[PDB]
Amino acid sequence: RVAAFDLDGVLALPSIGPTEQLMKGKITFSQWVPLQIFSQAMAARSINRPMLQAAIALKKKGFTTCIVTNNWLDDGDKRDSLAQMMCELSQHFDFLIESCQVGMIKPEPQIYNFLLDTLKAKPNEVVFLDDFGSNLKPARDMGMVTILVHNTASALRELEKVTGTQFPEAPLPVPCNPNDVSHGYVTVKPGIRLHFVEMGSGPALCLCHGFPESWFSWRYQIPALAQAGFRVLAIDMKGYGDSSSPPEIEEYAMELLCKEMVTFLDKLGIPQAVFIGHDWAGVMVWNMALFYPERVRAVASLNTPFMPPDPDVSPMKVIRSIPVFNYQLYFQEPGVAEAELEKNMSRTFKSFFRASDETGFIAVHKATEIGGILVNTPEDPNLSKITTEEEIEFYIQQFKKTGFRGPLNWYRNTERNWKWSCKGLGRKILVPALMVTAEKDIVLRPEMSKNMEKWIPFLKRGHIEDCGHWTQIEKPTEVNQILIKWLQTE
Amino acid sequence: RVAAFDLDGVLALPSIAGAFRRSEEALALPRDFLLGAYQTEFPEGPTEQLMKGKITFSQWVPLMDESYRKSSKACGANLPENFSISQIFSQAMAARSINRPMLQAAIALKKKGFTTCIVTNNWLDDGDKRDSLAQMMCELSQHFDFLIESCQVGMIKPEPQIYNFLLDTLKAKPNEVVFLDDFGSNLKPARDMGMVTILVHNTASALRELEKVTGTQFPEAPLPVPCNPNDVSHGYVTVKPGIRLHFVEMGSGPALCLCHGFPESWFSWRYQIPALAQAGFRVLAIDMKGYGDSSSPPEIEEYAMELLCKEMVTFLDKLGIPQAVFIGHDWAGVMVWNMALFYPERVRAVASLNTPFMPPDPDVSPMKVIRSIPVFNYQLYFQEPGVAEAELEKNMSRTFKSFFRASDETGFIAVHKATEIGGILVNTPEDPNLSKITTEEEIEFYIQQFKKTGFRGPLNWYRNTERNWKWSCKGLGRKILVPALMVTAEKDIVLRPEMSKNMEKWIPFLKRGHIEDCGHWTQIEKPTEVNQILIKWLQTE
Ligand SMILES: O=C(Nc1ccc(I)cc1)NC1CCCCC1
Ligand SMILES: O=C(Nc1ccc(I)cc1)NC1CCCCC1
């Protein structure tokens, strides 16, 4: 079947002659100063989330969702209030049936037959619900499953849970994806192009992903950040997904990555953004902050701490010591781990992406002994409760284009990176910063960030309990909160 | 060849120096006491660690304040206790803008074929108005091929280090390169290697004289920065199943969609795009459904206005924007106004170029009204499918130079005679002179961009004559309230100004814009103007 609700006050609230038909669309708001004080009433009404969530559910579930409300056209000033609130609901329903458009209001039987026509279905297999009920007269007539909404849910979730089946109580933020998205495509150097995704309106914040991921990762913070009130630019890190991913090694020097990261802003014409890296990106994100502070309004790292280099300590040597940094050494040899990971990506990803309470992880340190970062990993990885089968399939497809050379090439510029950063040795980071640490991150544990403020005074902190290395995907609702609260505050 | 420029004193101004001088004013402080940090010949210390890029600038406050306290009363001269240099630099910088004329001359020899660059003693700024710094660096970004900043490589002017590194970077000789600096004590080293010195003393021109000579001569009031076309972001939203919308993006928020007309491409706004970005907005110059890189089906209903506008919305939705400034020209302006009429929420403001708001009379078949305006013939000609396609397509090379001509250009189109002769380019020579308003490449693009779509789809915009009327016949009771602008072109043959005299009956407060000596090709013809107005508009309301 299909499920429908009205907005008047069921999917948004607090709820609410020339007035009776401006609904039909023959007149605007401003041009209607007869029979004013509410150009705010509408303002002070936002989304009814448990209700809005009920939708994505059913849509994920197999229905077609809609809005068939009695509208009007706001040339108001608290107009945008509407735009956004609408631009928000937008993607989650397939049909927008508004009175101010199809000329026919609620409750004239029109809209109902019109609705049913619009999708083409029987009065029975389509449910409806209005805060009004005086509107559910017709729908009950024809023969459709009616539902009131006199509270802010109740039987809504409950009696509507009848539908097919139910929904939860503490939801994940909404996903977002993966072609209902703008696909920008800046080209920096000759052969080098950078793909990315865009959502929401300014100011800008670049979401730089890590190894071995894709922009797809922020799939939960992207919408949220947009709504937050920012223009998100979730990029595919050089070498990954739809951006150019050469074979050359020097190609992935940090010095390089950061420089290009700038040419990106230039080309796109932005003079400053909020860089927010995680994993190997956070490294860059901080270097970003260290080498081009102008173009950075603020920085946030996820799990990754600011790890300066000791001028009197070969960088390699230091990698050979941290027991857990083995895999990392394993990698250093070209074609090798490529060959290992590539062989069967299906396994590769479910092995990598597992939680903080998940068996079968990676072989961080035995990796050289065992001679393979997956050898203690099953042969038929169990789907991590932290991803879906499609969630994986995307990562695969996205990786079939690049292979693994390039993403791995990020490790392989060990010496030089050190060589280069050995200049931000005299400097200190001043532009707003945030270090969000994950309690149970096996490599890149919190402990490694305790000195940071020696470098980054004012460094603000974020800490998420029960975390894996897969922060966004694992504790998103949290990540969002913090991330937003951060941007809001500073 | 090549010529690179310092960014202070020549490209960015008024210089940071002057600031120093007039604080060496605000306080006893004898000639050069404060500037000397910046200006020396033999550089050392706190600023030396800045220029070299060892420590940011904020670091550099504590250190250099207290570095001055040294030479203060301690060593001649009286320097105040509760004293500083911070916001008397983070101010003098935020107060320095681009030397319009320089940049102009800079783009010149890039066009003329030099490598342009800037070799400046920069520094990293983690300051407040640090942003001010980015924009300026953001802008100049394109016009110079090279960026040798002291604070990046690690050498400083005039330490020979840099020059020699610049040379090794281009890979030229001290001769075939020119240089200029507000300093001269900086110039010393290059007039030694063997480069062409230019004491960029003044605000310039004095410069641009014994400089004009070398290289060439610079136009009086050059052509406005025209974003161009390879190195621009290429967004790609997909609204309906088979339908995708290509567009271009430049600059940071708020957003304003530049909707082009027939028979063009997003490429048209190539002069307002940069300008609007700089203006301070995020430009989204779209390829109108059916044109260029966006999906251009064959179906007719496909281009219904009702449709085009609806999708235009799904566009915002997908891209996640709840409101924009729609600015149409030609057939787009029609949509742009309908935009305003049917989705006022999503419109913060509207601007039409040449196109007036032309409501439909409910008691007057729309077709009939087209048959009357003498000039609306071509328009009728079009109505027949495959026909004008076949005509225009045959040789696009001619097609475009014919269409795009000025207000003082012979060989235009056959607006009204059309049908009779059975064509619009029938009398248009079959070998057109290049309109002084375009370049050969300017044309080649339009071509290439059109080879992908053919002409069906762009023309399909005409062909929904009745329905469009049918639909708009609802905004008959409404009035447009969201900010509006009607900019009229004095000599637009069809879509003349006269046709907009009634508009305010519909659009009270409608603000006005009028450009003299104009063709239908407004942006491409009188851009510098268009820009001005357009900006002044967005600035004001
Ligand atoms: O290797 C890194 N991160 C990293 C390595 C070196 C630096 I300098 C910064 C981050 N991530 C791994 C963690 C375990 C699962 C695969 C990805
Ligand atoms: O036809 C239009 N514009 C137009 C037509 C109908 C409407 I309703 C609005 C604009 N433009 C022509 C002008 C002459 C050169 C080719 C393009």
Side-chain angles (χ1 to χ4, degrees):
Chain A
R1 24 225 33 74
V2 186
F5 344 84
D6 147 287
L7 176 78
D8 287 328
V10 149
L11 236 116
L13 30 41
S15 227
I16 307 237
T19 312
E20 134 236 301
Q21 46 72 295
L22 73 9
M23 257 190 166
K24 302 152 171 142
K26 264 152 139 264
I27 12 161
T28 93
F29 200 72
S30 306
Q31 77 167 188
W32 166 93
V33 47
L35 76 188
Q36 97 78 17
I37 313 157
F38 100 65
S39 217
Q40 335 92 8
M42 169 234 7
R45 86 152 169 178
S46 37
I47 291 173
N48 176 23
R49 344 243 39 143
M51 184 66 238
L52 189 192
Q53 223 118 42
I56 347 277
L58 281 129
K59 152 219 268 178
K60 178 178 141 58
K61 195 138 172 288
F63 301 45
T64 19
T65 57
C66 56
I67 330 260
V68 4
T69 171
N70 278 356
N71 228 333
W72 80 71
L73 331 96
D74 245 66
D75 356 28
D77 287 309
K78 263 74 126 194
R79 213 181 332 158
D80 46 11
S81 241
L82 215 349
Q84 342 168 313
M85 124 97 87
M86 292 296 339
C87 168
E88 178 136 12
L89 299 142
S90 131
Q91 298 298 293
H92 313 298
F93 296 91
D94 331 313
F95 288 135
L96 202 27
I97 319 169
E98 336 124 280
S99 58
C100 105
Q101 279 321 19
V102 294
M104 358 133 165
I105 66 60
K106 270 190 293 156
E108 293 185 311
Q110 318 299 292
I111 355 142
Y112 312 81
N113 258 296
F114 172 106
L115 191 150
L116 289 125
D117 278 311
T118 298
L119 10 272
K120 292 118 196 215
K122 231 77 183 168
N124 71 83
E125 73 154 69
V126 297
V127 5
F128 194 13
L129 37 116
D130 227 321
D131 62 332
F132 267 120
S134 6
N135 244 116
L136 290 131
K137 245 232 204 233
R140 219 283 92 158
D141 276 26
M142 324 209 127
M144 358 150 52
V145 200
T146 27
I147 325 249
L148 221 122
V149 172
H150 215 221
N151 56 148
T152 21
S154 174
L156 235 182
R157 17 203 266 210
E158 282 252 310
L159 207 287
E160 208 239 272
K161 246 149 190 134
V162 159
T163 52
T165 50
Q166 84 329 281
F167 2 94
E169 16 153 18
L172 267 70
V174 289
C176 108
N177 75 133
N179 86 109
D180 296 27
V181 244
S182 157
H183 278 277
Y185 283 98
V186 202
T187 287
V188 262
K189 243 197 284 174
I192 308 90
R193 144 241 294 227
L194 237 350
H195 163 237
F196 80 80
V197 173
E198 211 163 19
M199 245 241 221
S201 201
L205 45 101
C206 308
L207 299 203
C208 308
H209 74 119
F211 176 114
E213 300 144 288
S214 117
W215 65 267
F216 192 35
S217 315
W218 324 94
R219 65 185 152 286
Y220 286 95
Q221 19 285 141
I222 273 175
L225 287 187
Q227 256 99 209
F230 309 71
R231 168 203 188 169
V232 176
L233 279 80
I235 300 133
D236 245 337
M237 279 341 303
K238 179 159 176 173
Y240 300 69
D242 281 302
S243 326
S244 312
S245 110
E248 285 78 57
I249 315 296
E250 44 299 333
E251 213 58 14
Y252 300 58
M254 196 59 53
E255 174 175 9
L256 200 32
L257 308 177
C258 284
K259 157 58 135 9
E260 305 189 338
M261 221 4 101
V262 156
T263 315
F264 189 79
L265 291 243
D266 281 356
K267 249 54 173 146
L268 236 137
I270 328 258
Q272 262 191 15
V274 147
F275 282 102
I276 322 306
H278 156 274
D279 207 323
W280 253 121
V283 178
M284 163 187 76
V285 134
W286 290 116
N287 283 292
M288 258 334 286
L290 181 78
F291 280 97
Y292 313 102
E294 292 99 321
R295 326 288 262 95
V296 173
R297 151 75 194 130
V299 206
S301 202
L302 278 211
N303 310 32
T304 310
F306 180 40
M307 298 150 322
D310 336 61
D312 36 41
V313 184
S314 163
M316 249 312 203
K317 317 289 171 70
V318 359
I319 295 338
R320 301 222 270 265
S321 326
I322 346 308
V324 84
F325 284 28
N326 191 234
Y327 63 109
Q328 269 193 36
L329 233 128
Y330 166 36
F331 284 175
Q332 230 66 14
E333 241 317 290
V336 197
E338 265 90 326
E340 192 203 342
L341 305 166
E342 271 155 18
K343 277 276 172 310
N344 152 31
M345 276 165 185
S346 176
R347 161 254 329 233
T348 291
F349 294 100
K350 9 232 312 234
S351 290
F352 269 91
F353 314 134
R354 332 233 7 122
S356 74
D357 22 297
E358 229 118 53
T359 46
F361 223 105
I362 257 43
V364 238
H365 20 32
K366 57 182 217 147
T368 22
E369 235 195 278
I370 43 161
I373 197 182
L374 291 152
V375 211
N376 49 311
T377 311
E379 282 301 46
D380 207 34
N382 167 218
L383 218 154
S384 173
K385 98 218 183 132
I386 239 23
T387 64
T388 66
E389 178 133 308
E390 303 85 35
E391 281 206 71
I392 297 291
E393 236 319 324
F394 184 60
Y395 274 103
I396 317 193
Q397 161 230 106
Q398 255 270 92
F399 255 103
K400 310 248 63 163
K401 338 195 183 135
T402 29
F404 262 98
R405 226 272 214 310
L408 276 117
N409 256 74
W410 283 59
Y411 289 98
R412 339 224 172 115
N413 278 276
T414 342
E415 190 75 2
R416 18 167 64 106
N417 295 353
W418 167 92
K419 222 106 66 280
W420 182 56
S421 325
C422 262
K423 291 141 112 150
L425 282 174
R427 338 205 188 95
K428 224 162 262 227
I429 298 173
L430 300 154
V431 342
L434 207 232
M435 238 289 17
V436 159
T437 40
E439 159 161 58
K440 341 227 284 269
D441 189 11
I442 321 81
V443 19
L444 287 163
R445 233 132 164 149
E447 355 116 348
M448 348 200 3
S449 78
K450 50 197 249 303
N451 272 97
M452 280 191 73
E453 8 269 286
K454 174 216 160 192
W455 292 113
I456 303 151
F458 338 140
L459 193 181
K460 300 271 174 265
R461 254 104 182 3
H463 185 65
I464 325 191
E465 318 274 51
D466 311 275
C467 241
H469 169 49
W470 310 137
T471 302
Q472 334 107 144
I473 324 113
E474 161 140 37
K475 269 317 149 70
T477 141
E478 1 275 342
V479 180
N480 285 345
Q481 291 176 350
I482 304 183
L483 261 181
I484 296 145
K485 274 114 112 197
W486 176 48
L487 302 136
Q488 307 267 248
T489 59
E490 243 188 37
Chain B
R1 308 273 259 52
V2 52
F5 340 52
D6 180 45
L7 149 71
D8 206 64
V10 350
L11 248 68
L13 92 118
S15 87
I16 260 318
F20 273 152
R21 223 95 246 209
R22 292 168 272 92
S23 314
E24 293 189 6
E25 275 340 326
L27 322 163
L29 280 75
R31 315 100 239 278
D32 221 350
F33 186 43
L34 286 206
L35 196 225
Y38 228 38
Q39 153 183 118
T40 30
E41 256 212 349
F42 72 113
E44 196 241 322
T47 23
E48 209 242 315
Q49 299 298 267
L50 233 205
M51 302 323 221
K52 280 219 173 284
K54 316 243 247 106
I55 52 150
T56 92
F57 127 103
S58 352
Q59 236 122 73
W60 186 89
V61 216
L63 310 352
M64 246 276 173
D65 269 287
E66 244 96 273
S67 126
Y68 279 145
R69 158 205 266 70
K70 253 8 77 217
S71 330
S72 107
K73 128 95 83 27
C75 299
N78 190 282
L79 205 83
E81 329 116 349
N82 237 45
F83 174 48
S84 208
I85 204 131
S86 154
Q87 21 206 58
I88 128 186
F89 175 104
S90 83
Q91 202 42 89
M93 169 231 35
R96 85 175 173 169
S97 98
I98 275 142
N99 191 5
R100 319 263 54 126
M102 271 314 316
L103 211 212
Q104 225 89 69
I107 326 230
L109 302 108
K110 169 241 234 130
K111 181 175 141 55
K112 209 163 146 268
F114 274 66
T115 20
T116 26
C117 15
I118 28 209
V119 14
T120 192
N121 271 352
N122 236 327
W123 68 79
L124 324 85
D125 211 280
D126 27 7
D128 271 310
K129 5 297 214 211
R130 156 205 11 167
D131 48 24
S132 198
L133 207 6
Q135 300 160 28
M136 152 139 14
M137 286 297 335
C138 197
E139 212 154 327
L140 326 178
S141 123
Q142 311 280 310
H143 322 323
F144 308 84
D145 0 301
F146 287 136
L147 210 57
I148 345 117
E149 333 168 286
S150 64
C151 91
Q152 255 340 357
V153 283
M155 310 116 136
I156 45 100
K157 279 186 273 172
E159 274 195 323
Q161 323 304 333
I162 358 116
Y163 313 114
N164 250 279
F165 167 104
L166 146 160
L167 271 127
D168 274 271
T169 281
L170 307 306
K171 278 130 180 220
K173 224 84 181 162
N175 81 94
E176 39 173 277
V177 311
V178 15
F179 196 16
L180 2 88
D181 217 307
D182 57 291
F183 264 107
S185 321
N186 228 111
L187 284 169
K188 235 225 217 250
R191 204 247 195 255
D192 257 275
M193 322 214 61
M195 338 218 314
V196 224
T197 65
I198 326 195
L199 207 297
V200 182
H201 235 233
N202 198 201
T203 343
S205 231
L207 191 192
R208 301 207 293 152
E209 239 122 88
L210 225 280
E211 121 79 296
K212 233 147 184 127
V213 159
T214 350
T216 16
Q217 237 208 231
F218 310 102
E220 36 331 272
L223 327 86
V225 41
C227 88
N228 263 327
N230 293 236
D231 44 63
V232 319
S233 158
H234 278 280
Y236 283 100
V237 202
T238 287
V239 262
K240 243 196 283 174
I243 308 90
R244 145 240 294 226
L245 236 351
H246 162 238
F247 79 80
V248 173
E249 213 164 17
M250 245 240 221
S252 202
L256 47 98
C257 308
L258 298 203
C259 307
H260 73 120
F262 175 115
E264 300 145 287
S265 114
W266 64 267
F267 192 35
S268 315
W269 323 95
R270 64 186 152 286
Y271 285 96
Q272 19 285 142
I273 273 174
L276 286 187
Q278 256 101 209
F281 310 71
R282 170 202 184 171
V283 174
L284 277 82
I286 299 133
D287 245 339
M288 281 338 307
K289 178 158 175 174
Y291 301 68
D293 281 301
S294 327
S295 310
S296 108
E299 285 79 58
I300 315 297
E301 43 299 332
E302 214 57 14
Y303 300 56
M305 196 60 51
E306 174 175 8
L307 201 32
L308 306 176
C309 286
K310 156 60 136 10
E311 305 188 337
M312 221 5 101
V313 157
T314 315
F315 189 76
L316 290 243
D317 282 355
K318 247 56 171 147
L319 237 137
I321 328 257
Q323 263 192 14
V325 147
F326 281 105
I327 322 306
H329 156 273
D330 206 321
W331 253 122
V334 177
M335 163 187 74
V336 133
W337 291 115
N338 284 291
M339 257 334 284
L341 181 79
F342 280 97
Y343 313 103
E345 293 98 321
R346 326 288 262 99
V347 174
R348 150 75 194 131
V350 206
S352 205
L353 279 210
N354 311 32
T355 310
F357 179 40
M358 298 149 321
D361 336 62
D363 36 42
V364 184
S365 163
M367 248 309 200
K368 316 291 171 70
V369 359
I370 295 339
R371 300 222 271 264
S372 327
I373 346 308
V375 83
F376 283 29
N377 191 235
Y378 65 109
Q379 268 194 36
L380 234 127
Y381 166 36
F382 284 174
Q383 230 67 15
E384 242 316 290
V387 197
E389 267 88 324
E391 190 202 343
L392 305 166
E393 273 155 17
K394 277 276 172 310
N395 152 33
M396 275 164 185
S397 177
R398 161 254 328 233
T399 289
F400 293 101
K401 9 232 313 232
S402 290
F403 268 92
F404 314 134
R405 331 235 6 124
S407 75
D408 22 296
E409 229 118 52
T410 46
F412 223 104
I413 257 43
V415 238
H416 20 33
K417 309 262 185 199
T419 83
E420 224 31 49
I421 47 288
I424 356 173
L425 305 15
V426 185
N427 304 132
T428 328
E430 243 44 276
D431 41 278
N433 167 218
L434 218 155
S435 173
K436 97 216 184 132
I437 240 22
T438 64
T439 67
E440 177 134 308
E441 303 84 35
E442 282 205 71
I443 297 291
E444 237 318 323
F445 184 60
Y446 274 102
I447 315 192
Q448 159 231 106
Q449 254 270 92
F450 256 105
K451 310 249 63 164
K452 338 195 183 133
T453 30
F455 263 97
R456 226 272 212 311
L459 275 116
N460 255 77
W461 283 58
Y462 288 99
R463 338 224 172 117
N464 279 277
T465 341
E466 190 75 3
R467 17 167 63 106
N468 296 352
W469 167 91
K470 221 107 67 279
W471 182 57
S472 325
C473 261
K474 290 141 113 151
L476 281 175
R478 337 204 188 98
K479 223 163 262 227
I480 298 173
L481 299 154
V482 343
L485 207 230
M486 237 289 17
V487 159
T488 41
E490 159 160 58
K491 340 227 284 271
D492 190 10
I493 321 80
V494 19
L495 287 163
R496 232 132 164 149
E498 356 115 348
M499 347 197 8
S500 79
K501 51 198 248 304
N502 272 97
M503 280 191 73
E504 8 268 287
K505 173 216 160 192
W506 291 113
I507 302 152
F509 336 139
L510 193 183
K511 299 274 173 265
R512 255 104 183 4
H514 186 65
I515 325 191
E516 318 273 52
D517 311 276
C518 240
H520 168 51
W521 311 137
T522 304
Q523 335 107 146
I524 325 113
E525 160 141 38
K526 268 319 149 69
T528 141
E529 3 275 341
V530 180
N531 285 346
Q532 292 176 350
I533 306 182
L534 259 182
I535 297 144
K536 274 114 112 198
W537 175 48
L538 301 136
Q539 306 267 248
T540 59
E541 241 188 39

